[PDB]
Amino acid sequence: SLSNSSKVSVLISLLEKSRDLDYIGEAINQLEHSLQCAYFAQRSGADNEMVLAALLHDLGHYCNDTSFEDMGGYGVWQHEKVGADYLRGLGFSERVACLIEGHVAAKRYLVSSKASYLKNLSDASRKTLEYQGGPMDEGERRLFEEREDFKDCLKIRAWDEKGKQTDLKVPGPEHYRKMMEEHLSENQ
Ligand SMILES: [Fe+3]
Ligand SMILES: [Fe+3]
Numbered sequence: 001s002l003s004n005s006s007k008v009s010v011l012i013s014l015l016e017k018s019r020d021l022d023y024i025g026e027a028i029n030q031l032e033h034s035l036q037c038a039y040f041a042q043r044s045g046a047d048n049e050m051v052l053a054a055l056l057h058d059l060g061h062y063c064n065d066t067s068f069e070d071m072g073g074y075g076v077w078q079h080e081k082v083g084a085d086y087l088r089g090l091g092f093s094e095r096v097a098c099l100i101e102g103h104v105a106a107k108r109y110l111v112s113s114k115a116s117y118l119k120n121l122s123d124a125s126r127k128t129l130e131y132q133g134g135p136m137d138e139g140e141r142r143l144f145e146e147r148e149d150f151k152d153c154l155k156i157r158a159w160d161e162k163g164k165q166t167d168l169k170v171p172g173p174e175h176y177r178k179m180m181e182e183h184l185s186e187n188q
Contacts, residue, residue, distance in 0.1 A: 004184040007090050008177055010070070014059055015173040017067055023058075024122060024164045031173075034058055036163040039170040041155075048179050050152060052092070053099035054159055055176055059083040060100075080104045093187050098149055099156050104132055106157035109144050112136040120161045 002010065019031035038055035046054075060083030062068050072089070073082040084101035088094070107125060110117040112135035118126065129135070136144065144150060 004091075004181050004188075007184060008180045011056070011059075011090075011180060012173045012177065014063075014067055014070065015055075017063055018059065018061070021061060021063055027166065028164050030058055030061065033163045035170045035172060036165055036168055037156075037159045038176065039168075040159040040162060044155075044159075046155070048183060049093060049096050050099065050155070052176070052179060052183060053096050053156055055173075056083060056087060056096075057100045057103050057156060057160065060086065078104070091184050091187055093183065095149065096183070099152055102147070102149065102153040103157050103160060104128075105136075105144060106153040107160075108132060108134070108136045109141060110154065110157060112141055122161075122164070125161075 001007070015031055015034065018034065019029050021030035022028075023030045023033040034055055034057070037057065038051055041051040041054035058079060060071065060073060060079035060081065062073060062077075062079075068074065071082055071086040073086075076082050076085070080101050080103055084097040087100065088097045107117075107121070107129065111121075111129065121129070133140075144153075147153065
Protein backbone atom coordinates (compact mmCIF):
# COMPACT_ATOMS: atom_id res chain seq x y z
CA SER A 1 0.00 0.00 0.00
CA LEU A 2 0.97 3.66 0.22
CA SER A 3 3.51 4.89 2.76
CA ASN A 4 2.10 6.34 5.98
CA SER A 5 2.96 9.84 4.77
CA SER A 6 0.99 9.37 1.56
CA LYS A 7 -1.94 7.65 3.29
CA VAL A 8 -2.15 10.86 5.29
CA SER A 9 -1.96 12.94 2.10
CA VAL A 10 -4.95 10.93 0.85
CA LEU A 11 -6.88 11.58 4.09
CA ILE A 12 -6.08 15.27 3.97
CA SER A 13 -7.30 15.35 0.36
CA LEU A 14 -10.53 13.62 1.42
CA LEU A 15 -10.94 16.12 4.26
CA GLU A 16 -10.38 19.07 1.92
CA LYS A 17 -12.95 17.65 -0.47
CA SER A 18 -15.52 17.48 2.34
CA ARG A 19 -15.55 21.29 2.35
CA ASP A 20 -18.03 20.83 -0.50
CA LEU A 21 -20.59 19.17 1.82
CA ASP A 22 -23.08 21.20 3.85
CA TYR A 23 -23.18 20.41 7.54
CA ILE A 24 -25.13 23.18 9.22
CA GLY A 25 -26.64 24.40 5.97
CA GLU A 26 -24.17 26.28 3.78
CA ALA A 27 -22.96 28.31 6.78
CA ILE A 28 -20.96 25.45 8.33
CA ASN A 29 -19.55 22.93 5.86
CA GLN A 30 -18.42 19.45 6.85
CA LEU A 31 -14.73 20.31 6.84
CA GLU A 32 -15.24 23.31 9.11
CA HIS A 33 -17.34 21.09 11.38
CA SER A 34 -14.67 18.38 11.53
CA LEU A 35 -11.90 20.88 12.27
CA GLN A 36 -13.89 22.44 15.10
CA CYS A 37 -14.45 19.01 16.62
CA ALA A 38 -10.74 18.18 16.45
CA TYR A 39 -9.98 21.51 18.11
CA PHE A 40 -12.46 20.95 20.93
CA ALA A 41 -10.86 17.58 21.59
CA GLN A 42 -7.30 18.89 21.42
CA ARG A 43 -7.88 21.91 23.64
CA SER A 44 -9.86 19.87 26.16
CA GLY A 45 -6.63 17.98 26.77
CA ALA A 46 -7.79 14.82 24.99
CA ASP A 47 -5.26 12.26 23.75
CA ASN A 48 -4.22 12.01 20.10
CA GLU A 49 -6.59 9.14 19.39
CA MET A 50 -9.51 11.24 20.60
CA VAL A 51 -8.37 14.22 18.53
CA LEU A 52 -8.06 12.06 15.42
CA ALA A 53 -11.45 10.43 16.06
CA ALA A 54 -12.96 13.91 16.35
CA LEU A 55 -11.23 15.11 13.17
CA LEU A 56 -12.26 12.11 11.11
CA HIS A 57 -15.63 11.08 12.53
CA ASP A 58 -17.67 12.30 9.54
CA LEU A 59 -15.31 11.39 6.71
CA GLY A 60 -17.66 8.56 5.72
CA HIS A 61 -20.50 10.77 4.42
CA TYR A 62 -21.10 10.37 0.67
CA CYS A 63 -19.39 13.28 -1.09
CA ASN A 64 -19.05 12.20 -4.72
CA ASP A 65 -18.57 8.96 -6.65
CA THR A 66 -14.77 9.02 -6.69
CA SER A 67 -14.28 9.77 -3.00
CA PHE A 68 -16.92 7.21 -2.04
CA GLU A 69 -15.06 4.63 -4.11
CA ASP A 70 -11.75 5.66 -2.51
CA MET A 71 -13.32 4.91 0.88
CA GLY A 72 -15.24 1.77 -0.10
CA GLY A 73 -18.63 3.03 1.06
CA TYR A 74 -20.77 1.24 -1.53
CA GLY A 75 -23.08 -1.35 0.01
CA VAL A 76 -22.49 0.02 3.51
CA TRP A 77 -23.76 3.62 3.35
CA GLN A 78 -23.81 4.45 7.09
CA HIS A 79 -21.13 7.14 7.43
CA GLU A 80 -19.93 6.03 10.86
CA LYS A 81 -19.26 2.53 9.49
CA VAL A 82 -17.82 3.69 6.18
CA GLY A 83 -15.36 6.03 7.88
CA ALA A 84 -14.41 3.64 10.65
CA ASP A 85 -13.84 0.74 8.26
CA TYR A 86 -11.79 2.88 5.87
CA LEU A 87 -9.50 4.02 8.68
CA ARG A 88 -9.15 0.44 9.96
CA GLY A 89 -8.04 -0.54 6.47
CA LEU A 90 -5.44 2.22 6.44
CA GLY A 91 -3.98 1.02 9.72
CA PHE A 92 -5.60 3.29 12.31
CA SER A 93 -6.09 1.83 15.78
CA GLU A 94 -9.22 -0.10 16.70
CA ARG A 95 -9.77 2.52 19.39
CA VAL A 96 -10.01 5.35 16.84
CA ALA A 97 -12.31 3.32 14.57
CA CYS A 98 -14.59 2.44 17.47
CA LEU A 99 -14.89 6.06 18.66
CA ILE A 100 -15.95 6.99 15.15
CA GLU A 101 -18.25 4.04 14.62
CA GLY A 102 -19.86 4.67 18.00
CA HIS A 103 -20.89 8.30 17.50
CA VAL A 104 -24.36 7.43 16.24
CA ALA A 105 -24.96 5.15 19.21
CA ALA A 106 -23.68 7.98 21.44
CA LYS A 107 -26.41 10.28 20.15
CA ARG A 108 -29.03 7.59 20.78
CA TYR A 109 -27.76 7.23 24.34
CA LEU A 110 -27.71 10.96 25.05
CA VAL A 111 -31.22 11.51 23.74
CA SER A 112 -32.47 8.67 25.93
CA SER A 113 -30.60 9.92 29.00
CA LYS A 114 -31.85 13.50 28.69
CA ALA A 115 -34.76 14.26 26.35
CA SER A 116 -33.54 17.85 26.26
CA TYR A 117 -30.55 16.65 24.20
CA LEU A 118 -32.94 16.28 21.28
CA LYS A 119 -33.03 20.11 21.18
CA ASN A 120 -29.27 20.23 20.52
CA LEU A 121 -29.61 18.12 17.39
CA SER A 122 -29.39 19.47 13.85
CA ASP A 123 -32.27 18.84 11.46
CA ALA A 124 -30.30 15.96 9.96
CA SER A 125 -29.31 14.41 13.29
CA ARG A 126 -32.90 14.63 14.49
CA LYS A 127 -34.24 12.88 11.40
CA THR A 128 -31.55 10.23 11.05
CA LEU A 129 -32.46 9.22 14.62
CA GLU A 130 -35.81 7.97 13.24
CA TYR A 131 -33.92 5.38 11.19
CA GLN A 132 -31.30 4.39 13.74
CA GLY A 133 -33.70 2.74 16.16
CA GLY A 134 -34.77 5.89 17.98
CA PRO A 135 -33.56 6.67 21.48
CA MET A 136 -32.02 3.73 23.34
CA ASP A 137 -34.19 1.79 25.76
CA GLU A 138 -32.96 0.85 29.24
CA GLY A 139 -31.36 -2.43 28.16
CA GLU A 140 -29.54 -0.75 25.30
CA ARG A 141 -28.24 1.94 27.63
CA ARG A 142 -26.88 -0.76 29.95
CA LEU A 143 -24.95 -2.46 27.16
CA PHE A 144 -23.61 0.85 25.87
CA GLU A 145 -22.56 1.80 29.41
CA GLU A 146 -20.48 -1.41 29.51
CA ARG A 147 -18.37 -0.42 26.49
CA GLU A 148 -14.78 0.30 27.40
CA ASP A 149 -15.03 3.51 25.37
CA PHE A 150 -18.40 4.60 26.80
CA LYS A 151 -17.50 8.02 28.19
CA ASP A 152 -15.09 8.75 25.35
CA CYS A 153 -17.91 8.11 22.85
CA LEU A 154 -20.13 10.55 24.72
CA LYS A 155 -17.39 13.20 24.62
CA ILE A 156 -16.95 12.75 20.87
CA ARG A 157 -20.69 13.28 20.37
CA ALA A 158 -20.89 16.26 22.73
CA TRP A 159 -18.11 17.90 20.70
CA ASP A 160 -19.94 16.88 17.54
CA GLU A 161 -23.08 18.83 18.50
CA LYS A 162 -20.88 21.76 19.49
CA GLY A 163 -19.10 21.85 16.12
CA LYS A 164 -21.31 24.54 14.59
CA GLN A 165 -19.55 27.72 15.75
CA THR A 166 -19.96 30.62 13.29
CA ASP A 167 -16.90 32.63 14.30
CA LEU A 168 -14.21 30.14 15.32
CA LYS A 169 -10.68 30.08 13.90
CA VAL A 170 -9.26 26.57 14.08
CA PRO A 171 -6.29 24.88 12.38
CA GLY A 172 -6.75 23.16 9.02
CA PRO A 173 -6.17 19.51 8.10
CA GLU A 174 -2.41 19.92 7.52
CA HIS A 175 -2.10 20.84 11.19
CA TYR A 176 -2.87 17.21 12.02
CA ARG A 177 -0.52 15.61 9.48
CA LYS A 178 2.22 14.73 11.98
CA MET A 179 -0.33 13.42 14.47
CA MET A 180 -1.78 11.12 11.81
CA GLU A 181 1.64 9.99 10.58
CA GLU A 182 2.71 9.17 14.13
CA HIS A 183 -0.52 7.29 14.80
CA LEU A 184 -0.04 5.13 11.71
CA SER A 185 3.58 4.46 12.63
CA GLU A 186 2.71 3.53 16.22
CA ASN A 187 0.08 1.10 14.93
CA GLN A 188 2.11 -0.86 12.38
FE1 LIG B 1 -21.72 12.09 12.02
FE1 LIG C 1 -20.29 15.39 13.08
